[PDB]
């Protein structure tokens, strides 16, 4: 049979061994029979990639100039995986994604089909209760969830598998009462140990109404993630990532104290050093007493602590916690200016929910995580469904009913929902300015013709 399901999409199949040619041919045929724009094949086993820098420029020149939408691979063991997956945000999906997507006649979510064996929560649809957490806690839990391949939802549904809460006192528990209520150690365990949560340990992580005292929570945390030896030791082998670096941790990161211990152990197990700053510290003397401090880690770009810090140490690296975890995924220390806009201390909110309640289409996998992060730090909301509650539709291209409906509603002078591309979101944040989404550059819905227009490149 045939269809237009994959219309205007470019694919790249990585063949890891000659025995996989029949399934490579069988997948190209499904993609062509359903009207894909282009499907390149690349044989990993038939080229020497030793001592050639398979970097971002190498990849764009070798397989562009237009975007690749999906890389099809049943392994992540190839030397441009990190460039594809963490920088360019191109999904990497198994052969089965093509089969299932054809059978269901829809572009399925990429997460369950990732072959990264670290993506231990690829199945989970996770609600994180904002009422339960500070901003900086929420951002860290989302970072690690995304790094574990899970999906973040901002609504409870039948699809939802997990609800992350801090304590029985949290108001989300009561007002609700299938899916399971757990403490954030459910996330952190998978991250630290890289194996599923199955023992009696798995029982500790579930919401327990007897835990009305702080002393009990502290005690489950020290048990579940306190004390070590982990699985899949080969997956992040650079145990000196932060050697000769020393991080000053801002007091505007008011973490649950065991959560700070986790971040300190993560840093220190990667051979870095950590000093916590407090609000009453004299900063000149802290930095003079610890002159090897070369990085500041903070939540807000407008912290007074960060202003005085820059004055004392004007060459300090200035990052956020997200920045640490991105260095973790690249497995290389990397200056903030070479990372992404989301790896800086956050700007003050630009928009309100009322100005900015956006919906989006054709963004898979990490690009999805990225629009969501961007909307958050811009001050708005994002929804999975397009309704009339929405102020904008963000789009890359012109396909999908979602675009057609929203492009129709934008012709009405009363409605006035706006259709714009993602660079409006990005340039707004970078310039810290409410730019105009009907500008020429933000009406370009042919971004796929160039890979440099991939969401997340602006600010690099």
């Amino acid at each position: 049979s045939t269809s237009l399901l994959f219309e205007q999409l470019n694919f790249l199949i990585l063949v890891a061994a000659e025995a996989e040619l029949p399934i490579a041919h069988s997948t190209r045929k499904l993609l062509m029979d359903n009207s894909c724009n282009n499907c390149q094949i690349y044989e990993l086993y038939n080229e020497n990639l030793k001592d050639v820098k398979t970097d971002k420029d190498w990849f764009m020149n070798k397989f562009g100039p237009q975007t690749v939408h999906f890389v099809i691979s049943n392994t992540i063991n190839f030397p441009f995986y990190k460039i594809v997956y963490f920088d360019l945000l191109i999904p990497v999906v198994s052969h089965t994604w093509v089969q299932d997507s054809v059978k269901t006649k829809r572009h399925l979510r990429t997460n369950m089909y990732s072959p990264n064996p670290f993506h231990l929560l690829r199945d989970c649809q996770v609600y994180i209760s904002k009422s339960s957490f500070n901003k900086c806690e929420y951002i860290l839990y989302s970072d690690l969830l995304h790094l574990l391949g899970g999906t973040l939802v901002n609504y409870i549904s039948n699809r939802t598998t997990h609800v992350i809460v801090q304590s029985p006192q949290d108001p989300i528990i009561a007002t609700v009462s299938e899916w399971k209520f757990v403490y954030p150690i459910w996330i952190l365990y998978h991250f630290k140990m890289a194996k599923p949560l199955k023992g009696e340990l798995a029982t500790l992580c579930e919401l327990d109404m007897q835990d009305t005292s702080e002393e009990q929570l502290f005690a489950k945390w020290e048990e579940v993630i306190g004390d070590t030896s982990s699985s899949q030791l080969t997956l992040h082998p650079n145990k000196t990532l932060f050697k000769n670096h020393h991080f000053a941790i801002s007091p505007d990161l008011n973490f649950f104290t065991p959560l700070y211990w986790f971040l300190k152990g993560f840093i220190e197990d990667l051979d870095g050093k950590v000093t916590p700053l407090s609000f009453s510290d004299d900063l000149k003397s802290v930095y003079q007493a610890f002159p090897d401090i070369d990085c500041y880690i903070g939540h807000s770009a407008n912290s007074p602590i960060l202003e005085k810090t820059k004055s004392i140490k004007p060459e300090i690296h200035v990052g956020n916690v997200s920045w640490l975890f991105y260095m973790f995924a690249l497995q290389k220390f990397t200056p903030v200016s070479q990372c992404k806009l989301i790896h800086q201390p956050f700007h003050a909110k630009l928009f309100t929910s009322k100005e900015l309640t956006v919906a989006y289409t054709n963004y898979f996998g990490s690009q999805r995580f990225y629009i969501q992060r961007l909307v958050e730090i811009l001050g708005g909301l994002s929804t999975p469904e397009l309704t009339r509650k929405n102020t904008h539709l963000i789009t890359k291209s012109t396909i999908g009913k979602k675009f057609k409906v929203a492009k129709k509603w934008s012709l009405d002078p009363q409605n006035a929902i706006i259709v714009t591309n993602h660079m409006w979101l990005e340039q707004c944040y970078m310039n810290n300015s409410k730019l105009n989404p009907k500008d020429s550059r933000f009406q370009n819905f042919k971004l796929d013709d160039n890979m440099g227009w991939n969401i997340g490149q602006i600010g690099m």
């Binding site: 009422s131 500070n134 609504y155 409870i156 999975p384 469904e385 009339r388």
Partner: peptide, 22 residues
């Protein structure tokens, strides 16, 4: 009305929208 994801919510996003340090 509602155009689905294409890749149904009961408790909406705007209800529990605040962080405990807002």
């Amino acid at each position: 009305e509602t155009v689905p994801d294409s890749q149904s919510p009961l408790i909406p996003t705007s209800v529990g929208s605040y962080f405990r340090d807002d």
